[PDB]
């Protein structure tokens, strides 16, 4: 039972926060590059139910556009796309 990463597509404007959800050590990946881990602009917050996790990009930049996923250690999730439109 690998984790689930959503939304499959998230489009935000530069300046706002891009928040994903990983449901299931938990690692946030963007080959894979580790962004954050549970327990900078990439923060991971556990939800009250304990099984869901908010993975937010505080003040998303244009170059943050790409594919993201989360993995539990190494079972990985599907890849979600983030788009950051110019302002």
């Amino acid at each position: 039972n690998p984790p689930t990463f959503s939304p499959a597509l998230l489009v935000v404007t530069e300046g706002d926060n891009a928040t994903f959800t990983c449901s299931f050590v938990l690692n946030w990946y963007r080959q894979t590059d580790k962004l954050a881990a549970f327990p900078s602009r990439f923060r991971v917050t556990q939800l009250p139910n304990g099984r869901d996790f908010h993975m937010s990009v505080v003040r998303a930049r244009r170059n943050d556009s790409g594919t993201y996923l989360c993995g539990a250690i190494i079972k990985e999730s599907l890849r979600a796309e983030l788009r950051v439109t110019e302002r």
Partner: antibody
Amino acid sequence: EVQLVQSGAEVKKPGESLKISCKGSGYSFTNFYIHWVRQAPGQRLEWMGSIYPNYGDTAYNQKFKDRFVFSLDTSVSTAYLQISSLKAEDTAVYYCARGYSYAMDYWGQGTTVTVSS
Amino acid sequence: IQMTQSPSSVSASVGDRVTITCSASQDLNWYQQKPGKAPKLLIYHTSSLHSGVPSRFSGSGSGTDFTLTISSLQPEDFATYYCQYYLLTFGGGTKLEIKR
């Protein structure tokens, strides 16, 4: 828990119109793509296209461009496949599938479409 | 962007190891479909097993060649298998039948 239920079988005439429904349950419908796949009788699977419940992102196989249209209903969590100017070559089994931009991880049970005079 | 799924059909017995190949001309997903039923996702990202897929299913990929392997065949594994790459495109399909 993740279920995609499609509408019943469709028996139409050449030149009519139909709209297959695809209601998703057990997940946030607005967070995942909806893909559409066609399988002619005894043939292989062929990807028709996909549509996302937000931002208006749609992708179409070039064979099913202007005659096949995808629609969505976010507040009710239902996907739609409408086909106009129906032809006899459209007789196939049409699947809707939840997934991402590149994969289909949960499939509907399918809808058999028969078009004949 | 031209993939070829081989072979068209495989005959094997319960307990055998079966390898299905999809080769390109210049990641891959694998699906399983039984007669009259909807397909199921088996492998994503070339080698990651989907939720609920038994560990006897495994995938690998080296450049232009990708293989789906079923280590020990069970009675439930006889079906048709499709590889899919990404516009999404399915392979030709491989029917796995019972040998006798």
